[PDB]
Write a protein that binds this DNA or RNA. Structure first.
Ligand SMILES: O=C(O)CCC(=O)C(=O)O
Ligand SMILES: [Mn+2]
Length: 204
DNA sequence: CTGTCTCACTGTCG
DNA sequence: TCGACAGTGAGACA
């Protein structure tokens, strides 16, 4: 397996196709069968005083005994299922990084998306990386420097763009999530679903 | 109280 | 139709 080292000012990420086509195909099928996504309040978000559905399905899974913050609430992730443990194990076996939690985001097509954000690190093990594993449709992913955002950016730091392919792993290492925002922009020409798993190491 | 940060839509311009 | 870009606030903090 070949790794791409993604580097810029305050950006340190690595990218590889971690699962080959056949394995990634099987995993995608099993995720589509088995993952249980949020419904009701957890699938709603208020933005600028207006309520909308979250523009992607979400779920969490993790180790027994864990809790996390999401919406309004302190919540417990669902118990691991084997397909998720298969993925986690291969990530940990290759990288030596260990994870106790995963956020799953399912993008039905190019109209599902996630706006520019930094992962909330408050309840994460200090300095821990986040492993982003993708199955299904390739989707464009964008890194934008925190001081290069908006109408009149303080700095004109180059955006870093890359497609996240079927079976790929993007490792995002400290201090990427301090200095850079990332997003999965709307791509209306993408008609097929994508399931993304972001593994994290949360505080007990 | 006191700031700062966040989430995603809709409308306009091309 | 697509998309780039700007503009929109209430809630959770430190
Ligand atoms: O779907 C992706 O690849 C990004 C998801 C993400 O950044 C997140 O949920 O924090
Ligand atoms: Mn993220």
């Amino acid at each position: 397996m070949s790794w791409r080292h993604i580097r810029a000012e305050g950006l340190d990420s690595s990218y590889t196709v971690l699962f080959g086509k056949a394995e990634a195909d099987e995993i995608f099928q099993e995720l589509e069968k088995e993952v249980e996504y949020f419904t009701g309040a957890l699938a709603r978000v208020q933005v600028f005083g207006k309520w909308h559905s979250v523009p992607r399905k979400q779920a969490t899974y993790g180790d027994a005994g864990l809790t996390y913050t999401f919406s309004g609430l302190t919540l417990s992730p669902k118990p691991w299922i084997p397909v998720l443990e298969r993925i986690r194990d291969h990530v940990s076996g290759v990288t030596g990084q260990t994870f106790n939690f995963v956020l799953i985001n399912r993008y039905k097509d190019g109209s599902d998306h996630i706006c520019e954000h930094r992962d909330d690190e408050r309840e994460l093990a200090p300095g821990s990386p986040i492993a982003s594993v993708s199955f299904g449709a390739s989707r464009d992913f964008v890194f934008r420097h925190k001081d290069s955002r908006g109408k009149s950016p303080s700095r004109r730091v180059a955006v870093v763009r890359l497609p996240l392919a079927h079976g790929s792993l993007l490792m995002m290492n400290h201090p990427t999530n301090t200095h850079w925002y990332h997003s999965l922009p709307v791509r209306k020409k993408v008609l097929a679903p994508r399931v993304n798993l972001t593994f994290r190491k949360i505080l007990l």
